[PDB]
Amino acid sequence: TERTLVLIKPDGIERQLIGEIISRIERKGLTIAALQLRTVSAELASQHYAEHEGKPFFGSLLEFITSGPVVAAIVEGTRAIAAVRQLAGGTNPVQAAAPGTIRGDFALETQFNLVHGSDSAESAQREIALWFPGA
Amino acid sequence: TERTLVLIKPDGIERQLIGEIISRIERKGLTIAALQLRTVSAELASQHYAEFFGSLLEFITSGPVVAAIVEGTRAIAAVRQLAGGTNPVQAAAPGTIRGDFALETQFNLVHGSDSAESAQREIALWFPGA
Amino acid sequence: TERTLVLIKPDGIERQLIGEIISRIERKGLTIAALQLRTVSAELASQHYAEFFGSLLEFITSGPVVAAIVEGTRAIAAVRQLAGGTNPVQAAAPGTIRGDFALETQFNLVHGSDSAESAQREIALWFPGA
Amino acid sequence: TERTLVLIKPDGIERQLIGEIISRIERKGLTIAALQLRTVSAELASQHYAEFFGSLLEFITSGPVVAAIVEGTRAIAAVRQLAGGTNPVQAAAPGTIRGDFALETQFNLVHGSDSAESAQREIALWFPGA
Amino acid sequence: TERTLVLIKPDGIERQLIGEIISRIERKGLTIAALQLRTVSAELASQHYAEHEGKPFFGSLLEFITSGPVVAAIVEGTRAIAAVRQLAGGTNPVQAAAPGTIRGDFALETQFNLVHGSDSAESAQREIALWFPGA
Amino acid sequence: TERTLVLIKPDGIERQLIGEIISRIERKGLTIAALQLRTVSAELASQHYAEHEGKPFFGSLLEFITSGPVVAAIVEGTRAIAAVRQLAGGTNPVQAAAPGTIRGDFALETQFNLVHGSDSAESAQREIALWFPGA
């Protein structure tokens, strides 16, 4: 029984997919432990992507994530971390993600891949701390 | 352009309908202005339910709920439209949330403000700094 | 907590709606107590249809049907609710099985018992040892 | 067996509902006899809208529409059934196209001929050689 | 044109997926040749899993399959056997089954993978005999 | 931003999947630039399959494509060509196409795989010319 962080980015919201994404998580048999539509401080953004901070085009990541509010959620259940990455699909919506996955069905571009899921037990634990301090 | 309060009660959550209900709202053309899964204090429960009375509080507080501010043209009427009448079998038409998923008035899954006055008041309690 | 008889007639099957119809029942919160794809003897057909009369028997017996016992709170009313009025265009509302998929009264896909007395009798014929 | 004209207006297209609307028609048991995404000349727009008047033409011509001939038993009534009343919130029931997706009468996504006379005339304008 | 055995196990039923699973089969273009909700005798259970009888944790398989009634069905059509295994997904719902498949979309655990489909022409013929004697 | 040709063959229409297929394209984020239900001349058919003209069973391809009207469409958007082939699935609906794809979910036979999508920038440009002369 694991906990993982899930974000529905501003592009997932504008395209009216909040409900859709939650549904897919619920139906996989996972539970929404925490859920909140919120804004992202410039620092929370940099803290989230801190790992890719050095990398190229880092700045563009922060710009988008703060352009509108996001839906943050704690997803909980058996193999929650792997399962969510499964539902989401690979990073490139066309060359990687299979159809039937969130990105596979709805996305065309890596920048606008709608959703985020923690990639490891360590990442989840850290990301959950930033997004849900008192959890 | 109106704002209305929407609750997905503990029964809507256990039956895995959070996503479903939000989707229906989004597709009607409304926007989720605020959204939070939270617990309900005893006072908040009691004061929300002005209108057996006890079995309600034990219900609304038995688990966390999803509270939301829904915003858009005729948001109040539209949400009550999507939800259906109160009795899921004798009132709500199929195609509505209650019409499609509910059998009992107690467990009708969802709540929507019933008037401009109710919304304004309910939103205050559920989203103080809004 | 009631029990009602449900039939998915040969037209519902050919149009690939078995799954669809069961899903709608399950999601309303009802339970499939019994379920069987079977053929209909001439007597069973005739005796089911007490209420042109001949074209019916030739229909109900033209292929196998899916018989089911549906069980739950207000099961009888709920199923008739999901199904819709008899005339798919002039009576049944959209969102209902007939409302969404049917055009003709003859081919309205599905049957649900119309009363506590009817259910009890119909269940006896279709599921003798129940 | 009737023929009726159906339009998916520019608002239905921008909201990505072409597929959705066609699906609902197909599943009711109707057939798409003709189908074309096209632009609307000013005369065609004006003459279609015999029944603020100006904001309509600017709407129907603001982008291409999907025109279709829908054919089948009671096609005319059935399509108006699927579509819902004109005011998406006060008239159309949920389960209908307008009931599920629309909030405003101006942007009610879709059009269906309202009578045998209207269909025959509208089909002539939109599909001259039909 | 093949025939294959399909079971909707007690977990598929409790999770309200009978309709869902049948729908997916129908839409693939297959036909329900036989269909019945029934209980499973202790021996029918052992006869079904006879192959994995020796294997470890064999007993736990029999316990679950008999804990509630199942929906048995004969599915018929072109490549029915392969098609059904396709719709179902690999055995491990998270590490094997792709999303879009029954297990891929709804399951987290191998024990509770909701559904069964014959794995070969020989298996189908034998399994159909046990579950639908006069077929 | 690419343009690709899409056909909903006579089998996709008889099985009532026009709406379904368009929906999947729209939801991926692509736009229907052109759309028309039409009949296929014997020559248009041979012009379309001109590449496989020499190949065996060529004649059977022309027979089917002309047996009823088809829905032709120009699909437009980012990576439109790859995306559409993604949504469609591999050619053999059972051995290649994954579930979640059009062929994966609805087809059993290669002949009746419901749908067509241009396979390259060169193919699209040529196919669009034949199907939508004044485009």
Author numbering:
A (entry chain A), E (entry chain A), F (entry chain A): 2 to 136
B (entry chain B), C (entry chain B), D (entry chain B): 2 to 52, 58 to 136
Paper text:
One interaction present in Mt-NDPK but missing in other NDPKs, is the intersubunit salt bridge Arg80-Asp93 located on the protein surface. Here, to elucidate the crucial role of that salt bridge for hexamer and overall protein stability, a mutant having the salt bridge abolished (D93N) has been prepared. The D93N mutant crystallizes along two different space groups. The two structures are similar (0.40 Å of rmsd for 135 Cα) and differ only slightly in the conformation of αA and α2 helices due to crystal contacts. The overall B-factor values of the two D93N structures (64 Å2 and 71 Å2) are similar and higher than that of the wild type (31 Å2). Analysis of B-factor reveals that (1) two domains, the αA-α2 region (40–70) and the CTerm part (120–136), are highly flexible and (2) the beginning of the Kpn-loop where the mutation is located appears more flexible in the mutant than in the WT structure. The D93N mutant enzymes displayed catalytic properties very similar to those of the wt enzyme, within experimental errors. In presence of urea, the mutation of the negatively charged Asp93 into the neutral Asn had a dramatic effect on the hexamer stability. : the c1/2 of the wt hexamer decreased from 5.2 M to less than 0.5 M for the D93N mutant. The D93N mutation appears to decrease the protein stability because the negative charge of the Asp93 interacts with distant protein charges and stabilizes the hexamer. The lower contact surfaces between subunits, as compared to other NDPKs, are compensated by the intersubunit salt bridge Arg80-Asp93.
Nucleoside diphosphate kinases (NDPKs) catalyze the reversible transfer of the phosphoryl γ of nucleoside triphosphates to nucleoside diphosphates. The two-step reaction proceeds via a covalent intermediate, the enzyme being transiently phosphorylated on a conserved histidine residue, His117 in Mycobacterium tuberculosis NDPK (Mt-NDPK). Crystal structure of the Mt-NDPK has been solved. It is a hexamer with a tertiary and quaternary structure very similar to other hexameric NDPKs.
